[PDB]
Design a protein around this ligand. Structure first.
Ligand SMILES: NCCc1c[nH]c2ccccc12
Ligand SMILES: [Ca+2]
Length: 223
């Protein structure tokens, strides 16, 4: 997260870190045994880390649970990043509490102008490289479809939306991938892609979660 703020320990209780020897992506806990992330975060040997603030220090509220299975969306295209969504099932159910909690799926899509919270452990620099240990947060509005398409000609599908600031300076970044965009207590977005981070006229692009609620529910019900 570039140009954000320190969230505060366990204030984003649905935020997870995906670990394969190291943090490599964010995710969102949507029930006691399932996490939503980005399809471009797919790899084998994933351990889901819940209740994290400092990802380099065991602080006492963590739950580490290995993934039993990952399900990349059937229509995910890694070239265009269309349908950039993946489900991860935990080998055992997380113990839910005030610091490890699920986030609700949307019942409706959020409109341009809606204020949201974007979070993660990604790079905090737009040019350099610096990775924080504690969770970073950014409040950002959803941008109009037209401004999003104008920013990225030929690249925005109906399964994507832009959020952030056309002036630059505030954005998600590398390592935030797969993490949450939450608006009014609903998971509306997944950190997907962009051209660099926090660059003028290049806002972050996010997977449009409301398009996937049926697939998510249906998949969980049979897996
Ligand atoms: N807005 C951040 C989009 C993003 C995801 N992964 C990245 C890697 C490098 C640069 C940007 C990104
Ligand atoms: Ca920790």
């Amino acid at each position: 997260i570039v140009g954000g703020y320190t969230c505060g320990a366990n204030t984003v209780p649905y935020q997870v870190s995906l670990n394969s020897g190291y943090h490599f992506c964010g995710g969102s806990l949507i029930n006691s045994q399932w996490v939503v992330s980005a399809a471009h975060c797919y790899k084998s040997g994933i351990q889901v880390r819940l209740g994290e603030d400092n990802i380099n220090v065991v602080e006492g509220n963590e739950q580490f649970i290995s993934a039993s299975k990952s399900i990349v969306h059937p229509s995910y295209n890694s070239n265009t990043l269309n349908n950039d969504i993946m489900l991860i099932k935990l080998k055992s159910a997380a113990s839910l509490n005030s610091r490890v909690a699920s986030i609700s799926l949307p019942t409706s899509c959020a409109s341009a102008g809606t204020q949201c919270l974007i979070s993660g452990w990604g790079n905090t620099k737009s040019s350099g490289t610096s990775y924080p240990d504690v969770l970073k947060c950014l409040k950002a509005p959803i941008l109009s479809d037209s401004s999003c398409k104008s920013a990225y000609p030929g690249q925005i599908t109906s399964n994507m939306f832009c959020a952030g600031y056309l002036e630059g300076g505030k954005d998600s970044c590398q390592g935030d991938s797969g993490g949450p965009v939450v608006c009014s207590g609903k998971l509306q977005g997944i950190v997907s892609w962009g051209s660099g981070c926090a660059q003028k006229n290049k806002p972050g692009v996010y997977t449009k979660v409301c398009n996937y609620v049926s697939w998510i529910k249906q998949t969980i019900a049979s897996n």
